[PDB]
Amino acid sequence: EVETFAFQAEIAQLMSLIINTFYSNKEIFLRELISNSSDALDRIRYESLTDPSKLDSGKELHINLIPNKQDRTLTIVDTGIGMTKADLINNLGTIAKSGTKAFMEALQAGADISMIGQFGVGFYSAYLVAEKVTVITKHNDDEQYAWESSAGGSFTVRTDTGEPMGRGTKVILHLKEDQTEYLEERRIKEIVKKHSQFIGYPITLFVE
């Protein structure tokens, strides 16, 4: 059973801006998603200090980058804290409205799209390179869900029947036809070295 939701108008506007603005420095999407993974790994690690059973769903704290040229997908996998259904349907859009407003204001004031992460909404930079984004996520307090959006003002949420993850988040980028450079080992290595060299978790770039 698939549920379809409308984005808040401000988030739909942000997604249209990211899709429509001419901006060549698209590679920053990967820094933003890796940063989000690192933050989610920090969260589960710190929570585990007070409740060690929170790692019963998996002790390993890592980030995997998985290109697939057959499917034309780049997947950013982490074993961080994950997201609840309530996050996916309500909490994320509610909290992000203020960051989105501040970001779009900053852009009019001359700021650059690369500053998007300072406003808490760097996830949406995925749409610089992806025509569709699928997020598979598992939080200790909830079931495994699949969120998906091709923009256009709506997203879907369903329970995920795929391979159980234990805990964490997979961001699956269905790349635009002209953005397949982000499936190349040499290109991903270059971007991780440039923007993500000090992330405090192992980043494994899978190869094909």
Ligand X SMILES: Nc1ncnc2c1nc(Sc1cc3c(cc1I)OCO3)n2C[C@@H]1CCCN(Cc2cccc(S(=O)(=O)F)c2)C1
Query: Which of ligand X, K ion, none interacts with 179 (beta carbon under 5 to 8 A by kind)?
Result: none
Residues comprising the chain, all counted = 208
The residue (of 17 and 180) whose beta carbon lies closer to ligand X is 17
Give the contacts of 206 (CB within 8 A, at least 6 positions apart): 64, 65, 66, 67
One residue of 12, 19, 55, 66 binding K ion per CB under 5 A: 66
Collapsed DSSP state (helix, strand, coil) of residue 197:
coil
Assess 68 for contact with K ion (CB under 5 A).
Answer: yes
Q: Which residues bind ligand X (CB under 6 A)?
A: 36-37, 39-40, 78, 80-83, 88, 92, 95-96, 98-99, 120-121, 123, 135, 147, 169
In whole angstroms, what is the distance from residue 143 CA to residue 160 CA? 8
* 64 annotated binding-site participant: no
User: What is the Cα–Cα distance from 146 to 151, expressed in whole angstroms?
Assistant: 15
Residue 12 Cβ, how far from K ion at the closest point, in Å?
26
Minimum gap (Å) between residue 190 Cβ and ligand X: 22
Told to check if 84 binds K ion by CB under 5 A, we report no
Task: State the nearest-atom distance from the C-beta of 133 to K ion, in Å.
Answer: 12
Does the annotation list 78 as a binding residue?
A: yes
Q: In what order do the strands lie in the sheet with 3-6?
A: 3-6, 154-159, 144-149, 130-138, 168-175, 73-78, 63-68, 203-205
**Residue placing its CB nearer to ligand X in the complex, 184 or 205:** 205
Residue number with the smallest Cβ distance to ligand X = 120
